[PDB]
């Protein structure tokens, strides 16, 4: 029992995925706004709004993030040629989502140091099906729930660690939860 909802709403790309539709409700709202509520400490979900294709852009986000347990708030996206999955993690709960990734330095931008990591996913699900691909992570030290993200600064930092990002696929400001509860409303511009 899985559910994936993607498209364009309010003039923005949106994406919402869950493996337990009964414990999470995603609401597409006006312009770049979305809400999510999750409850029952059951299921994995990721959802939010942004762009497809992504770019080196400034992502402004404003809202309220009220998690309880394992959850994060991140700019999240993909490239192809090469296939890359990336995360700019602005806030997280009781689990650091980069756990197990390899430390790869620091970038200071938008009012915080971010710790950089890289990792490899082997024979794993992706936007292209089962693939082996690289991940990049920037994890914000100064956790926050509103601000602006200079994605180009991160992309540049990652390009000084390993292979560079490819041609952009989707790019969203996402809320994720894993067997937890919470709610959030975010507006992306």
Residue numbers in the entry: 5 to 193
What do the study's own words say?
Endo-β-1,4-xylanases (EC 3.2.1.8) of the GH11 family are capable of hydrolyzing β-1,4 glycosidic bonds between two D-xylopyranosyl residues linked in xylan polymers. Two highly conserved glutamates at the active site of GH11 xylanases trigger the hydrolysis of β-1,4 xylosidic linkages in xylan. In the first step of catalysis, the acid/base residue E180 (numbering to NhGH11) acts as an acid and protonates the xylan, while the other catalytic residue E89 acts as a nucleophile that provokes the departure of the leaving group to form a α-glycosyl enzyme intermediate.
To study the structure function relationship of a new xylanase from the GH11 family the crystal structure of N. haematococca xylanase (NhGH11) was determined and refined to atomic resolution (1.0 Å). The overall 3D structure of NhGH11, consisting in total of 193 amino acids, is displayed in a single domain with β-jelly roll folding. Overall, the three-dimensional structure resembles a right hand with the fingers represented by two antiparallel β-sheets and a thumb loop located between strands β10 and β11. Inside the active site the carboxyl group of E89 (OE1) is hydrogen bonded to nitrogen (NE2) of Q139, hydrogen (HG3) of F137 and a water molecule (W49), while the second oxygen of the carboxyl group (OE2) is forming a hydrogen bond to Y80. A calculation of solvent accessibility shows that NhGH11 contains seven buried water molecules. NhGH11 is a mesophilic xylanase that can catalyze the efficient breakdown of xylan-based substrates at an optimum temperature of 45 °C and a pH of 6.0, and due to broad applications of its hydrolytic products NhGH11 can be considered for a wide range of corresponding industrial processes performed between 40 and 50 °C.
